[PDB]
């Protein structure tokens, strides 16, 4: 969503899929230009972590976003949280009728 | 002291009717409390009209110099100051264990 | 509140905070007066 | 944030605002094959890499 | 004896101890520190001077631009306390500082180029401590609780039972610093003396020893002794050391050439030591048995042959030493030690260390400090040595070094500031002799290891940190500029200071939100002792040992007083007679009793000396002369109340008050009620409710006037004089010259706290007590604050209370109140709340404060004028509109069918909308004060002008008065010259008032020029002089106040310990009344006494009625029109029942006019002041009640107002004292159950006060999972509390009516679901 000023309130995941898909075409570009395995798999290393960073980053270091010091809210982080299962459990929506 | 305040406070009230003065259960409210009961032990009440007895010392053992006074009158500073240590005890305990 | 129920709640009349939940469906309502009502469960799961 | 890959910007509403009425609830543009649909269905609409 | 105000109200002083030392200013510790802080100090008074000097000079290297320091000039109060509290601006004063800058020439023998000394550098505006005594910054009065942390030294705490787990438990030792690093030292029965830093692991003590380059040989030659063993005539002799035979068992016949002194069998205790010392056993024939376990302090090999045998520090075995008895050796120097008392502990620790050299030992320290790159030497040296040896950042003053030497048993109480290698060795030896069993363990409870901090001390250190953040920001400029480039006001900062000053006086964990609603409320929430302090006792470390009480607190600290709630257990209050030492200690006033005569000379002892001398309690019976009538008394030798002879006692407590605090002394007969109820009572004190008409407490201690009169709550006078121009805003006093300083004529200005705001939505209330037309004295009052009358502290209020159970309406805390109170506003509190609206500036353009209010109803118009503000004095309740706020819509919001209009037609005819602000749900009062400000540089609408006019006249109305008085003076001067040069009484009485020649001529004119230039100036300031932060330019400040009366559910209690909440509103006379006529208002039940030891209910009540009885006869002796002589003797009996105890009589002036009026003010009872820990007793009370004919037995028979019957067994009824707290439920009763939730997710938005709601947690989830009701369980975690769509889709149907629901699809699942889809998992629902 755009703001009054010209800024965009994109989410963490967006800059993550951007990352994964950018290098995805870059890898296929290393196919269109034919690079040795040492190098195509160098990009595979980059796309390897890409997949990871999206899920929960598995266990590497919690991929951050450009210029902002903050571990991104991944998929598993939309699941995990406070008291086990974040939302539904801990603080699960203010009670109605009481 | 018990052997005293109990007989006293259980039948000393006598009134005449259809004969001579028959002994009736003390009309004293303390007696009614010690019969049916509502809230509050008649043992601490016992240590209100009678000598409180002994308490815990600032070290851990039991006082070698007992409180011989009663809470009907205002008992002494120093011995109640040792009784102040007793207060400490109680309060704290309840507090964290819950 | 009715005094003869406070024994169960182990409370008195001087500051006991309680919340009142509204039964939005007949489901809650029916359990309410059937299996939850004071006058309908004068027994404890410890004995009589 | 694509219409064809994921879904209708708004409910049955095109981004170019070309299609509006309910009867064209499945029409596919010869160029952009984007079926106008309920944005709720845009939770089930998965994409791929 | 009696002053101007004592002419109207006097408190019956009754002390058992004839005093020599009288009560001082109640808030000493606090207010005088403020005086030391913000003032001209030519030396270094703890305050702005100590901080600046401990950081100055700012010395750098290569270039030398050494910034030095001189002094600093401050600012006096500009406005009055009245409007400062109403407008809502920080009541501060500009801080101007005199900084000196001596720029030296690059590498020249101190060749100064410029020694430019500039003053008044803008270092911010330090928040002023009002005349009241608070830090008014963001409208809320905030004050810092003085603190306390661990005093520099070394402690040895036991802490048993926590970590034994077997039976071989130990203790811990912590060497405390002041400003540096804490040090851990631990010796254990496990035969391993360790040592480590706070952020360390387990490392031997020998890792500092070997690291200090002290090799194995250098170590065991210091720790152990050198004994000269010799082999003469070919036989081992031994220099037996009896002092080093303590606790050793006698296995061999301990002899001296034939005479076996210590027998083989019975051991060495402490008697045979003397039996070996007496004969000097230092050269006897001994076998080699006893030595076959000693390591050598040298090297010995075969010199007759030529063979190498051993190295150094090794036990010499059976055959080796035998060879050292045949080859050619006559001397043997081994380290004398044994296995019971003295042990070779470090000899058993060097083996623990994997290394033996300084180099690798530091590499081991490098493994601890910084795990990473392969080691070298750079890293080691740096870190470690610059920690304990660099003195610039590591210091210990003269308090840390004292507890060092004294606990390490020395004599010099002063030394260095750092910690040396020889001290690492010696303090280690301290722990060593405590492991041998030759020494003992100390305790932290000793206030010697307890540093009591003042607000000033804490000040220097927090600000010390601020100065470092800025010092290493200035040293760069300093190192670069060689010539005169760096100039004053280009190096020092302001923000790091701003976010520091505001940060300490109102944001640090030392300062707290003072709840203002009573003088004592302020006092006890101001001056106490707080372990919460920065670097103090936290609740996650301090255990039971730290909270224990000890008689060593008798005289300075109050384990008694410690509030209930968040900060409990870690308080232990400061005393009234307590004076924080120059550095960190605290001195306690004790009278010097020299072997018989108790001298009135008061002394100041420390916690060491107190626990070192024999002192008497406050319970020491003196008589006739003041000396002990007895020959024996209970005295603390080290903190233990025991028996001592009169010829041994050295001290005795001065007065019965020289031991407790404000909250301790305030409670009458503390000795009788429990102190834990005083703990809870401690909390309740700082929450006393503001009543409108404060009737006085019938009983006290003598510190009641110490609160009311000396709390700042009243406009006092420093220079007494005839009251002149007294108003509800400011009080003007014409000073008398016998107490006047010839400076500035004589017009003392004072500001009043006449109904303004306070932290807890409160409203401080001042009650005028002095009528116009009377001189005052230095220390006289004009208008006392809240809950005070003519100078007496009446926190809550005193009234009729009876004790009788009604089964239902008064179960202990449940209080039975009668309509009376709430109906007569005899106990009403006032509350002012504050709101404000943020200003303009938008990505589109400026903003307007509405200037109207578009498309609304009739109501919303009759209240908002052309300024966009609501009429002050209107009806603002529920959610009425307050400030009209305009907001530039924006590109993003525009619409298709509306465009082109605002593209042709005009400009601001549509782009703007309305997003005002309204009254928060829960407020029903009246908008009072409104202060607004406009657009600096480019003026706003008509409001800019409405502001100027407003303020110009607000100031004019005051500056005119004070000149009219003086012009009346010059009026006299002319009428004095005119008549002598031609009498014109009638003529000047007919001519207008505008019809030393040169004198008047000149002064009149100078005055006129000022007038002109000043009006210009004010207008100037509001036109372009609006110096504010960019953004905050069109702001609003509006206050709303609500009259609040007590409602069912309010917390009333007492100063003793019993709480309570007002219950069902009861009629007036359905309550049993008495012989007086007033029906009881309060009804409780002493049923809690037989249960918890709050005997106040039996007692405090009894005596309460006693004191009012005396008042009933004063009532009598005035209502009968009695002469001043009758009641004069009544007053004599009042101060002379028949004793020598003090009450302080008069007998000096007219006992007619000034004794009779005293009856006209005490016909409501006679307040009595009683001694804290040796107060009034039975026989005294009764003596008073038999004077005329009074109810000695305050247990009168009650007539039930319900009809007229008499109850059985007359009851304890009469006047007692209640204490309502700030717990007015209207601060927490902001009903919310259904409103608005979060946007991004199901986030709960709500705090503690407004927008409240029950927190449903996972544990409450289990409660639902614990009951047979599974249907409400279903609801509770699906539609009732989960689905954001679930409740919407169902609420829009329950409003239509349908008794049954359907689940749907939880979005939470929709997250987990798709997430696993990325991995490769399938959801399946079939049939």
């Amino acid at each position: 969503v755009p703001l009054d000023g010209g800024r965009f309130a994109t989410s963490d995941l967006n800059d993550l899929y951007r990352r994964v898909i950018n290098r995805n075409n870059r890898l296929k570009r290393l196919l269109d230009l034919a690079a040795p395995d040492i190098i195509v798999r160098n990009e595979k290393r980059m796309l390897q972590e890409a997949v990871d960073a999206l899920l929960d980053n598995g266990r590497r270091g919690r991929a951050i976003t450009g210029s902002n010091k903050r571990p991104l809210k991944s998929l598993a982080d939309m699941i995990k949280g406070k008291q086990g299962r974040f939302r539904q459990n801990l603080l699960g929506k203010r009670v109605d009728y009481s | 002291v018990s052997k005293a305040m109990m007989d006293n406070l259980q039948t000393e009230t006598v009134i005449n009717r259809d004969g001579q003065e028959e002994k009736q259960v003390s009309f004293n409210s303390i007696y009614m409390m010690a019969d049916s009961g509502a809230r509050g032990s008649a043992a601490q009440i016992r240590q209100l009209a009678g000598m409180r007895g002994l308490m815990a010392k600032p070290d851990g053992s039991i006082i070698e110099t007992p409180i011989t006074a009663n809470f009907r009158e205002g008992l002494n500073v120093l011995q109640y100051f040792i009784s102040t240590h007793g207060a400490r005890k109680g309060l704290a305990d309840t507090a964290l264990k819950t | 509140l009715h005094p003869l129920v406070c024994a169960a709640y182990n409370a008195d009349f001087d500051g006991d905070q309680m919340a009142v939940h509204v039964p939005l469906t007949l489901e809650a309502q029916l359990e309410a007066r059937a299996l939850m009502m004071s006058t309908n469960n004068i027994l404890s799961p410890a004995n009589g | 944030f694509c219409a064809r890959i994921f879904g209708p910007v708004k409910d049955y509403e095109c981004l170019c605002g070309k299609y509006k009425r309910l009867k064209h609830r499945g029409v596919i543009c010869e160029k952009c094959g984007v079926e106008v649909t309920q944005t709720k269905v845009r939770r089930e609409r998965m994409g791929h890499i | 004896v009696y002053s101007y105000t004592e002419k109207k109200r006097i408190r019956k002083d009754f002390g058992k101890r004839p005093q020599v030392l009288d009560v001082p200013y109640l808030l000493s510790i606090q207010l005088d520190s403020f005086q030391k802080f913000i003032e001209q100090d030519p030396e270094g008074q703890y305050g702005l001077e100590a901080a600046f000097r401990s950081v100055f000079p700012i010395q750098s290297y290569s270039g030398n631009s050494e910034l030095q320091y001189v002094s600093y000039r401050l600012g006096e109060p500009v406005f009055d306390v009245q409007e400062c509290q109403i407008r809502g601006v920080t009541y501060s004063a500009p801080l101007r500082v005199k900084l000196r800058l001596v720029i030296y020439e690059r590498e020249a023998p101190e060749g100064t180029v410029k020694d430019i000394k500039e003053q008044e550098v803008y270092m911010g505006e330090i928040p002023l401590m009002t005349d009241n005594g608070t830090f008014v910054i963001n409208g809320t009065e905030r004050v810092i609780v003085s603190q306390l942390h661990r005093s520099p030294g070394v402690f040895f705490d036991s802490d048993k039972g926590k970590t034994h787990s077997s039976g071989k438990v130990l203790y811990n030792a912590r060497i405390i610093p002041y400003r540096g690093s804490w040090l851990d030292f631990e010796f254990d029965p496990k035969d391993n003396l360790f040592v480590r830093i706070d952020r360390r692991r387990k490392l031997p003590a020998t890792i500092i020893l070997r690291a200090l380059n002290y090799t194995t040989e250098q170590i065991l030659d210091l720790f152990f002794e050198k004994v000269i063993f010799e082999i003469r005539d070919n036989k081992l002799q031994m220099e037996l050391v009896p002092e080093r035979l303590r606790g050793e068992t006698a296995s061999f016949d301990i002899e001296a050439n034939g005479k076996v002194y210590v027998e083989k069998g019975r051991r060495i205790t402490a008697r045979h030591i003397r039996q070996l010392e007496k004969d000097d056993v230092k050269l006897i024939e001994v076998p080699v048995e006893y030595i076959a376990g000693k390591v050598v302090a040298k090297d010995y090999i075969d010199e007759s042959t030529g063979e190498l045998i051993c190295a150094a520090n090794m036990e010499l075995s059976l055959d080796l030493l035998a060879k050292l008895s045949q080859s050619g050796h006559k001397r043997i120097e081994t380290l004398f030690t044994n296995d019971l008392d003295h042990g070779p502990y470090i000899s058993e620790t060097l083996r623990v260390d994997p290394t033996n050299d300084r180099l690798s030992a530091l590499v081991e320290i490098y493994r601890m400090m910084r795990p990473g790159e392969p080691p070298t030497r750079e890293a080691a040296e740096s870190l470690f040595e610059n920690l304990f040896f660099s003195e610039d950042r590591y210091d210990l003053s003269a308090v840390g070094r004292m507890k060092f030497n004294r606990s390490l048993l020395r004599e010099e109480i002063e030394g260095s500031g750092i910690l040396s290698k020889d001290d690492i060795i010696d303090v280690m030896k301290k722990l060593i002799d405590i492991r041998n069993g030759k020494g003992e363990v100390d305790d932290i409870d000793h206030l010697g290891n307890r540093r009591i901090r003042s607000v000033g001390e804490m000040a220097e250190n927090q600000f010390r940190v601020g100065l470092v953040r800025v010092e290493r920001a200035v040293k760069e400029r300093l190192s670069l500029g060689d010539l005169d480039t760096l100039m004053p006001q280009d190096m020092i900062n302001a923000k790091p200071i701003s976010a520091a000053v505001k940060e300490f006086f109102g944001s640090s964990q030392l300062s707290q939100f003072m709840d203002q609603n009573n003088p004592l409320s302020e006092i006890t929430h101001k001056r106490r002792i707080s372990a919460l302090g920065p670097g103090g006792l936290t609740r996650e470390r301090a255990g039971f040992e730290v909270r224990d009480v000890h008689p060593t607190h008798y005289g300075r600290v109050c384990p008694i007083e410690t509030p209930e709630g968040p900060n409990i257990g870690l308080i232990n209050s400061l005393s009234v007679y307590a004076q924080t030492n120059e550095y960190g200690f605290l001195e306690t006033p004790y009278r010097k009793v020299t072997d018989g005569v108790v001298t009135d000379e008061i002394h100041y002892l420390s916690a060491i000396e107190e626990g070192n001398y024999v002192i008497a309690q406050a319970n020491s019976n003196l008589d006739e002369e003041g000396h002990f009538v007895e020959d024996l008394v209970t005295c603390r030798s080290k903190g233990e109340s025991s028996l001592f002879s009169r010829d041994q006692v050295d001290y005795m407590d001065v007065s019965t008050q020289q031991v407790v605090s404000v909250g301790a002394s305030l409670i009458p007969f503390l000795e009788h009620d429990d102190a834990n109820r005083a703990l809870m009572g401690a909390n309740m004190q700082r929450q006393a409710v503001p009543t409108l008409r404060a009737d006085k407490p019938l009983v006290g201690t003598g510190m009641e006037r110490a609160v009311a009169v000396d709390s700042g709550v009243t406009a006092v006078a420093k220079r007494g004089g005839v009251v002149q121009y007294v108003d509800a805003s400011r009080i003007v006093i014409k000073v008398n010259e016998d107490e006047m300083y010839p400076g500035e004529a004589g017009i003392d200005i004072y500001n009043l706290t006449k109904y303004t705001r306070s932290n807890q939505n409160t409203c401080i209330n001042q009650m005028p007590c002095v009528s116009l037309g009377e001189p005052v004295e230095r220390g006289d009052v004009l208008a006392d604050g809240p809950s005070t009358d003519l100078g007496e502290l009446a926190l809550g209020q005193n009234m009729r209370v009876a004790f009788m159970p009604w089964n239902g309406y008064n179960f202990e805390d449940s209080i039975l109140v009668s309509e009376r109170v709430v109906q007569e506003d005899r106990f009403t509190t006032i509350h002012i709340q504050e709101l404000a609206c943020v200003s303009r500036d938008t990505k589109l353009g400026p903003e307007e404060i509405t200037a109207d209010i578009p498309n609304v109803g009739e109501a919303a118009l009759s209240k908002l004028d052309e300024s966009g503000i609501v009429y002050i004095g209107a009806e603002v309740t529920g959610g009425d509109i307050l400030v009209g706020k305009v907001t530039p819509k924006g590109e993003t919001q525009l619409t298709p069918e509306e465009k082109l209009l605002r593209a042709i037609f005009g400009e601001k005819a549509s782009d703007v909308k309305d997003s005002s602000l309204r009254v928060p749900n829960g407020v029903s009062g009246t908008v009072i004060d409104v202060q607004v400000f406009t657009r600096d540089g480019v003026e706003k609408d008509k409001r800019a002008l409405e502001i100027e006019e407003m303020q110009l006249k607000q100031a004019k109305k005051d500056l005119s008065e004070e000149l009219q008085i003086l012009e009346a003076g010059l009026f006299s001067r002319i009428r004095a010259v005119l008549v002598a040069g031609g009498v014109e009484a009638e003529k000047l009485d007919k001519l207008p008032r505008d019809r030393q020649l040169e004198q008047l001529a000149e002064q009149y004119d100078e005055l006129k020029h000022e007038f002109e230039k000043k009006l210009e100036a004010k207008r100037r300031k509001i036109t372009q002089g609006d110096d504010l932060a960019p953004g905050v330019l069109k702001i609003v400040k509006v206050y709303l106040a609500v009259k609040r009366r007590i409602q069912p559910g309010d917390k009333m209690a007492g100063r003793h310990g019993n709480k309570g909440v007002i219950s069902k509103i009861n009629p007036i006379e359905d309550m049993p009344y008495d012989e007086n006529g007033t029906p009881v208002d309060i009804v409780l039940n002493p049923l809690g006494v037989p249960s918890r030891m709050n005997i106040g209910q039996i007692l405090e009540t009894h005596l309460g009625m006693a004191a009012k009885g005396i008042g009933d006869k004063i009532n009598a002796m005035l209502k009968q029109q009695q002469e001043v002589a009758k009641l004069r003797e009544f007053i004599q009996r009042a101060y002379d029942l028949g004793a020598d105890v003090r009450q302080k009589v008069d007998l000096s002036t007219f006992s007619d006019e000034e004794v009779m009026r005293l009856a006209e003010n005490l016909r409501k009872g006679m307040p009595i002041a009683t001694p804290v820990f040796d107060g009034a007793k039975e026989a005294e009370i009764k003596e008073l009640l038999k004077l005329g004919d009074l109810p000695t037995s305050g247990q009168i028979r009650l007539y039930d107002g319900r009809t007229g019957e008499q109850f059985e067994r007359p009851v304890t009824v009469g006047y007692m004292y209640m204490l309502k707290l700030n717990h007015l439920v209207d601060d927490k009763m902001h009903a919310r159950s259904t409103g608005s939730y979060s946007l991004v997710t199901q986030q709960p938005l709500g705090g503690k006060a407004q927008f409240g709601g029950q927190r449903f947690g996972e544990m409450e989830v289990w409660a639902l999972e614990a009951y047979g009701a599974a249907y409400t369980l279903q609801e509770m975690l699906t539609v009732k509390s989960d689905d954001v769509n679930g409740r919407t889709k169902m609420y829009k149907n329950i409003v239509d009516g349908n008794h049954q629901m359907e689940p749907g699809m939880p979005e939470s699942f929709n997250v987990l679901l798709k997430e696993i889809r990325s991995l490769g998992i399938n959801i399946e629902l079939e049939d």
Side-chain angles (χ1 to χ4, degrees), chain E residues 173 553 601 627 759 765 773 932 1001 1018 1069 1071 1080 1174 1261 1311 1313:
Chain E
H553 293 302
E601 298 187 303
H627 307 306
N759 304 59
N765 144 67
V932 299
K1018 301 301 175 59
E1069 292 185 298
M1071 306 296 99
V1080 61
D1174 193 62
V1261 175
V1311 177
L1313 184 61

Side-chain angles (χ1 to χ4, degrees), chain E residues 590-628 630-657 659-833 835-839 841-842 844-847 849 851:
Chain E
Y590 284 128
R591 295 174 60 179
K592 186 63 178 63
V593 183
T594 308
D595 296 304
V597 291
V598 183
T599 309
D600 298 305
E601 298 187 303
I602 56 177
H603 293 183
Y604 297 122
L605 291 69
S606 58
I608 306 175
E609 301 177 299
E610 181 181 299
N612 184 63
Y613 295 119
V614 51
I615 308 169
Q617 197 178 62
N619 188 182
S620 306
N621 295 305
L622 52 64
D623 186 64
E624 283 300 298
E625 306 179 304
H627 307 306
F628 294 120
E630 297 67 55
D631 60 303
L632 54 68
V633 65
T634 61
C635 305
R636 296 183 299 291
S637 59
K638 301 179 179 299
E640 301 296 299
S641 58
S642 60
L643 285 297
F644 271 121
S645 180
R646 181 189 177 184
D647 189 62
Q648 298 180 300
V649 296
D650 294 302
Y651 294 114
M652 179 187 104
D653 190 54
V654 185
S655 301
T656 182
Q657 300 167 55
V659 59
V660 288
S661 60
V662 293
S665 64
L666 190 70
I667 305 176
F669 303 113
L670 183 61
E671 60 178 62
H672 293 301
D673 316 284
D674 191 62
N676 185 181
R677 284 289 182 176
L679 183 160
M680 310 181 105
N683 182 63
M684 297 187 274
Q685 297 304 62
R686 60 87 169 294
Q687 300 180 307
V689 67
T691 178
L692 291 182
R693 295 301 183 67
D695 288 306
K696 66 290 181 175
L698 301 172
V699 295
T701 177
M703 302 291 269
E704 303 302 298
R705 293 172 52 182
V707 183
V709 181
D710 293 303
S711 180
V713 295
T714 181
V716 298
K718 293 69 178 184
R719 298 185 303 180
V722 185
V723 295
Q724 187 179 302
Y725 196 57
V726 185
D727 295 304
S729 306
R730 56 183 183 181
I731 300 178
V732 180
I733 305 299
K734 188 61 180 182
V735 186
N736 53 59
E737 304 180 302
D738 61 297
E739 295 185 300
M740 175 190 102
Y741 299 126
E744 305 185 303
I747 305 81
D748 278 309
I749 182 180
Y750 293 112
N751 315 298
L752 297 64
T753 49
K754 292 288 296 299
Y755 302 107
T756 47
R757 202 200 179 189
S758 179
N759 304 59
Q760 195 68 298
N761 301 305
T762 331
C763 172
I764 182 172
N765 144 67
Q766 189 169 72
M767 291 170 75
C769 69
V770 183
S771 183
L772 184 67
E774 180 181 60
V776 295
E777 187 181 61
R778 182 180 187 299
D780 190 297
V781 299
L782 283 299
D784 298 303
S787 299
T788 59
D789 189 61
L790 246 169
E792 300 189 307
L793 179 62
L795 308 77
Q797 189 174 59
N798 55 303
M799 67 280 271
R800 295 286 294 178
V801 56
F803 290 118
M804 181 179 269
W806 277 65
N807 191 184
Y809 290 120
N810 55 300
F811 283 123
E812 294 185 57
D813 300 303
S814 181
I815 304 176
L816 193 67
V817 184
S818 62
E819 182 176 55
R820 184 76 67 173
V821 190
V822 65
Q823 182 174 64
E824 294 193 301
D825 295 51
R826 58 177 299 189
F827 199 64
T828 303
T829 178
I830 303 178
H831 297 297
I832 302 183
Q833 301 182 60
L835 293 74
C837 188
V838 62
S839 55
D841 180 60
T842 310
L844 296 177
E847 293 191 309
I849 302 68

Side-chain angles (χ1 to χ4, degrees), chain E residues 511-528:
Chain E
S511 172
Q512 297 188 57
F513 301 116
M514 183 194 94
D515 288 345
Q516 185 187 63
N517 46 52
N518 188 62
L520 203 291
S521 180
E522 304 176 298
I523 302 180
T524 184
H525 202 181
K526 284 184 183 180
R527 186 175 66 63
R528 290 180 299 175

